[PDB]
Ligand binder design. Sequence first.
Ligand SMILES: *[C@]1(O)C(=O)N(Cc2ncon2)c2ccc(Br)cc21
Ligand SMILES: *[C@]1(O)C(=O)N(Cc2ncon2)c2ccc(Br)cc21
Lengths: 304, 304
Amino acid sequence: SGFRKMAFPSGKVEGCMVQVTCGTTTLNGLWLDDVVYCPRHVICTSEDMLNPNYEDLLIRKSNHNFLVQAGNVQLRVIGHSMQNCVLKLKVDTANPKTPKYKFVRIQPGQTFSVLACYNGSPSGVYQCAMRPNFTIKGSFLNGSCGSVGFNIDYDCVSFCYMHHMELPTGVHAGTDLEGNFYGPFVDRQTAQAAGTDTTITVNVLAWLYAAVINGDRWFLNRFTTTLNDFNLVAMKYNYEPLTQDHVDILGPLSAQTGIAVLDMCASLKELLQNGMNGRTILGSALLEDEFTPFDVVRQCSGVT
Amino acid sequence: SGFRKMAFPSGKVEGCMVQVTCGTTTLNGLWLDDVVYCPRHVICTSEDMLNPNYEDLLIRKSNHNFLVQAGNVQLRVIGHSMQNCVLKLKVDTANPKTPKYKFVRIQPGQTFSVLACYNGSPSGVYQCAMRPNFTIKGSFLNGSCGSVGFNIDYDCVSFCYMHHMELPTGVHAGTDLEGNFYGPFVDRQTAQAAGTDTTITVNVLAWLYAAVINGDRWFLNRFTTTLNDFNLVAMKYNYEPLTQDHVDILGPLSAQTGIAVLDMCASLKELLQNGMNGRTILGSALLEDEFTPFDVVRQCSGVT
Ligand SMILES: *[C@]1(O)C(=O)N(Cc2ncon2)c2ccc(Br)cc21
Ligand SMILES: *[C@]1(O)C(=O)N(Cc2ncon2)c2ccc(Br)cc21
């Protein structure tokens, strides 16, 4: 009973957070085995950020210029390399708390937990989604760069995001753990604008299924629709178009509730056209799109 | 930049979760030092829950009837006692991962993180508030009892809640770590109704301050009000009355934004009277009341 925006338990990731300092810049790092991963802009001053040439700035750096502190103890840096927008600092000690892990590059619409950190110390955990415009709406302050996003499958942590930037609109941008940015963003203090932040239709549908499972059923209408008809409305309301791949992943939710996917589409279509009329679904006055169909299944089934 | 419903990092609490089984009933336990705390109804069958006499049911139980498993290893129970609605199982091994901790009984309106668990294993973390009617709107399924709620001050975990019950309306009820229920609820499968779930006014104001700090300023009106005038409106809209104690705790937010507390009250008064008019504040189409003034300060200042 009940439905919450829930993050993964963060312990496995807390045990990987370190502080990385290069000169006067301090950021967060992720220590997995004998490597510390961190944003490459840890080498920049505020002035360098306006127009950095990272390869050039890296020529002036040796292993001993990167200070890595795990808890209150210093790790010895024995190698360093730049991979896309991340630096990989080889340390002489494997992290004893390294969980089983993978690096995954997620698709727009996918959710993940963020462990917001400052000075290598965790401050909080929250749930995000990779927006269709490849930004995330996080909660980050100065020194948050290097905080990571992740999903957990039983005992394996799949790291999918590292925080690198804040757009002038207050939305956030970053990379996967191979240092490749999501979307067209660059790690530079230059004004970068985001594209249309459309609604993640398959996630809204999943959340409407979660609402039906938890008793909120007022919005269920007497209609059905087709994928093409639904998508004309989705396009008009800046919703992502729904594909048969999205219908497929909603199959278990359709099976549990007995509500055909296209019937839920028609109910969503009416909600877009009529609005909520001052009503709420799962305590929300708007349609929530940061629960994937897997998140709803996980939460509604009690996966640990 | 950005503002999120954020939970505390849960690692310190994950290291305390154990599974407790008594006969055929399995629930979660909290292992701190050499004691495991769990709901006393771990001794009940489904039939016992309809009308339990816990002292009587406890006469038939010895130390060896409580099976406590930490990870995949069995702890030896060397004592047991009932304190209000919790059982305390003395084990022969102190939890090596016991964080610094306290047991605190929170007041209505206070928020905390819940680490939802099943079979002693964490499934997710989310942020809750103790409602003014002493229920919480959690996300709990079968076997979730024994999951705890907590706050963290630097390195000290203040445990404030243990999950014991689900009301027939799907809202939740439980105790502090001394086993005393919040509100009038009893650990019995009998229909129990909740009182009026009013809005936590001081939390809404704190969240309006967070909105102003993050750039959402459309709702700021040209009015002021008094505590008495504001409270007439608060009472009409099922909002908690605002006291000078609440104005006091909003002082730092008032100072950071230059918006007097009573001016924010007048802006809230107009929002109650006019509604949102299809607009959102911090991505919400309703007024959020599960951020305390301390949560807003913590999040907006980056406390770790
Ligand atoms: C990154 O180094 C960092 O910590 N921040 C601060 C921030 N505030 C909000 O989101 N991030 C940051 C901002 C901009 C850049 Br180009 C890098 C960083
Ligand atoms: C408690 O033992 C438990 O795990 N549950 C299940 C539950 N589902 C949703 O919230 N809790 C429970 C329900 C009712 C009682 Br009286 C005790 C428990």
